[PDB]
Amino acid sequence: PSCVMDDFRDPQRWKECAKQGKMPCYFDLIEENVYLTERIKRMQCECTPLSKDERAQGEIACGEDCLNRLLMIECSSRCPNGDYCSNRRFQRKQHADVEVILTEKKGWGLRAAKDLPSNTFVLEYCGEVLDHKEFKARVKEYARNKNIHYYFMAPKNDEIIDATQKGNCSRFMNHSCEPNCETQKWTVNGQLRVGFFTTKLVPSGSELTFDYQFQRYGKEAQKCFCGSANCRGYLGGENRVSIRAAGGKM
Amino acid sequence: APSTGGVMKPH
Numbered sequence: 001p002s003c004v005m006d007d008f009r010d011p012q013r014w015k016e017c018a019k020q021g022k023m024p025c026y027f028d029l030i031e032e033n034v035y036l037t038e039r040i041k042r043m044q045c046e047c048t049p050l051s052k053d054e055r056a057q058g059e060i061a062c063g064e065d066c067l068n069r070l071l072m073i074e075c076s077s078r079c080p081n082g083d084y085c086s087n088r089r090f091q092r093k094q095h096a097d098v099e100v101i102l103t104e105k106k107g108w109g110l111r112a113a114k115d116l117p118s119n120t121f122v123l124e125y126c127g128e129v130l131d132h133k134e135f136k137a138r139v140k141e142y143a144r145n146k147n148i149h150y151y152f153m154a155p156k157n158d159e160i161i162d163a164t165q166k167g168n169c170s171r172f173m174n175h176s177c178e179p180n181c182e183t184q185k186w187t188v189n190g191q192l193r194v195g196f197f198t199t200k201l202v203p204s205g206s207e208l209t210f211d212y213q214f215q216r217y218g219k220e221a222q223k224c225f226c227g228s229a230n231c232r233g234y235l236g237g238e239n240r241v242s243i244r245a246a247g248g249k250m
Numbered sequence: 251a252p253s254t255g256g257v258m259k260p261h
């Protein structure tokens with residue numbers, strides 16, 4: 001079982017494919033984070049604009065030496081390189097070509113549909129941004145529902161991104177003690193956005209994974225099936241954390 | 251406590 005990302009656009013066909021076990025269970029697809037209604041501008045880079053001949057010669061706009069990129073800030077529409085700017089990947093949704101696949105023991109997963117060079121933007125981790133009090137409410141709800149999969153991302157020093165009910169296909173990225181992706185915290189238009197990026201050349205067909213650095217507050221630990229010869233055993237490690245520490249409250 | 255559950259962390 002395998003399905004490309006444009007399969008998730010028709011919710012009726014998606015829902016019916018899911019009833020047949022060929023697609024994962026329905027969730028609300030979103031293109032950008034949804035906040036729970038909480039929600040002079042010039043952060044230009046210093047790249048000298050590419051001439052229209054340089055464009056024609058293959059030069060990159062806002063490449064590796066772009067001051068915005070080097071600080072993990074995306075350029076805006078006003079970037080000196082304009083339409084050429086290659087540092088608007090989150091905003092333009094310039095994702096890697098990936099598929100959602102069914103794994104043996106971890107539920108559904110993400111695999112590369114073509115070779116991805118190292119340091120390649122995979123997908124943004126989108127979800128609902130929760131404050132600490134809605135986080136606790138969802139902890140209770142997901143526990144009482146007896147969910148198996150959890151989808152809480154805790155950006156360091158920041159609110160939880162919950163992709164359990166709304167998100168994109170990045171919510172399928174499984175954990176590995178020996179991963180081939182990393183998260184990267186980027187700012188787009190003053191807002192934090194978290195992206196998955198490759199850390200090595202991922203060959204076509206390989207599962208994409210990252211290190212959850214998972215913080216378990218559940219009583220019962222989850223054995224890790226990443227299969228790495230240096231596998232840490234359980235998703236959460238040896239010790240359980242409180243609910244407030246898991247949610248990043250000191 | 252909840253039976254299962256946890257939070258992923260970037261770092």
Ligand SMILES: C[S@@+](CC[C@H](N)C(=O)[O-])C[C@H]1O[C@@H](n2cnc3c(N)ncnc32)[C@H](O)[C@@H]1O
Pocket residue numbers: 105106107108109148149150151171172173174175176222223224225226235
């Ligand atoms: C962010 S979800 C990833 C998508 C999920 N596999 C699904 O089918 O919806 C994380 C959940 O997937 C499972 N999972 C991910 N990586 C795992 C691993 N290495 N070993 C065991 N379970 C894993 C656990 O159930 C965890 O709660």
Ligand SMILES: [Zn+2]
Pocket residue numbers: 045046047061062063066067068069075087
């Ligand atoms: Zn630039």
Ligand SMILES: [Zn+2]
Pocket residue numbers: 045061062066075076079080081082085086087
């Ligand atoms: Zn730019």
Ligand SMILES: [Zn+2]
Pocket residue numbers: 176177178224225226227228230231232233
């Ligand atoms: Zn492991």
